[PDB]
Amino acid sequence: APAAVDWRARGAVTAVKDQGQCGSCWAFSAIGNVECQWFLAGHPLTNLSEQMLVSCDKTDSGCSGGLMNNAFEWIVQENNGAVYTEDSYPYASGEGISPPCTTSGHTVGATITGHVELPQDEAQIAAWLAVNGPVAVAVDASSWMTYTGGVMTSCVSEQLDHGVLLVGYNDSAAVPYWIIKNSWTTQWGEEGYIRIAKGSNQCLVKEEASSAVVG
Ligand SMILES: *[C@H](CC(=O)N1C(=O)C=C(OC)[C@@H]1C)[C@H](C)NC(=O)[C@H](CC(C)C)NC(=O)[C@H](CC(C)C)OC(=O)[C@H]([C@@H](C)CC)N(C)C
Ligand SMILES: [K+]
Ligand SMILES: [K+]
Ligand SMILES: [K+]
Ligand SMILES: [K+]
Numbered sequence: 001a002p003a004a005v006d007w008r009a010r011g012a013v014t015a016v017k018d019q020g021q022c023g024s025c026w027a028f029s030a031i032g033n034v035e036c037q038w039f040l041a042g043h044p045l046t047n048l049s050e051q052m053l054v055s056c057d058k059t060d061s062g063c064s065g066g067l068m069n070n071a072f073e074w075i076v077q078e079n080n081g082a083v084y085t086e087d088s089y090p091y092a093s094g095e096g097i098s099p100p101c102t103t104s105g106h107t108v109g110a111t112i113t114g115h116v117e118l119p120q121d122e123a124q125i126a127a128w129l130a131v132n133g134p135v136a137v138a139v140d141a142s143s144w145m146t147y148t149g150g151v152m153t154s155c156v157s158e159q160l161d162h163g164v165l166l167v168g169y170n171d172s173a174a175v176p177y178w179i180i181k182n183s184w185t186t187q188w189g190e191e192g193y194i195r196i197a198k199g200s201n202q203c204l205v206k207e208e209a210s211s212a213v214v215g
Contacts, residue, residue: 001127006168006179007134012036013167014047016192018185020094026066027053028183029163033068033136034083034212036167038110040133041214046109047086052079054093055101062098068136068163072115072212085109113215122199125209126169134167134181138208144182147189151177152196155203166205169198178205 007013014035019028027050039045053060057074060066075083088107092099118125118135129135141162143155153175168179176198186192196202 001123001130001171003172004168004170005126005130006170007036008167008179011045012039012133013181014045016181016186017050017091017183018094019050019183020091021096022054022063022093022098023065024050024054024063024093024098025183026060026068026071026163029136029138029165030068030071030212031083032165032181032183033134033210034110034112034214036134036165037112037132037212037214043110048109049084049086049089049091051086051091051093051099052084052089052106054098055089056103063093063096068138069115069117069208069210072112072210075112075212076114081111081113082106082108083110083112111214112212114213116211116213118209118211120206120209122201122206125166125206126171126198128211129166129169132211134165134211136163136210136212137166137180137205138163139180139203139205141203143203144194147194149190150195151175152194152202153200155196157202157204160204160207166209171198178202
């Protein structure tokens with residue numbers, strides 16, 4: 001692996017978004033992973049639709065929660081790989097309640113064929129990300145509300161509750177670290193990002209890492 005990677009510097013990551021009062025983190029994680037994957041497949045960076053998942057993926061639970069894996073599964077086994085563009089299925093759940101789902105004629109902004117699952121090993125996740133781009137991951141984020149910047153070294157790491165996107169790491173530093181995209185607007189953290197220490201499984205970050213596959 002290289003000493004440091006940051007996919008934002010390669011234009012592979014969209015603007016920081018805002019889930020509102022909806023527990024749809026899982027959606028924003030999964031969709032952000034696909035957005036990056038599509039670009040790295042050689043297509044242009046495009047905002048894809050979390051509202052599609054929140055409203056139409058029935059195996060997950062909309063604003064009451066879900067899982068990135070399920071979402072990749074539902075997209076491929078139930079939605080023929082189609083991830084609609086945001087422009088075409090805009091986000092409407094920011095108030096907290098999620099609208100019903102109805103679908104003549106949306107614009108497919110991306111086609112995935114599957115997903116992969118990464119080992120529960122930070123070095124292995126990093127080697128994959130170094131080659132193939134941002135990784136969907138789960139974390140314990142109970143210590144996060146109070147975050148305003150810096151590298152987290154004492155993350156409460158007891159129980160997973162939130163999905164985010166790993167977009168880089170830096171093993172060069174005195175304290176190595178992951179770079180993670182959150183979905184709580186750019187008001188929160190380091191313009192909407194958080195760095196957490198790398199190598200101590202901070203926030204259980206390695207426990208549930210996965211990625212969509214553009215095939
Ligand atoms: C998004 C998380 C979130 O929105 N927020 C926080 O974590 C803190 C916040 O403060 C502002 C905001 C509100 C939602 C609520 N979390 C989830 O959807 C998680 C994401 C995964 C951990 C990747 N999923 C679940 O909680 C999931 C719910 C079912 C799939 C319907 O529950 C589990 O993953 C549990 C397990 C962790 C408990 C042992 N599993 C047994 C289903
Ligand atoms: K080098
Ligand atoms: K695994
Ligand atoms: K720890
Ligand atoms: K995994």
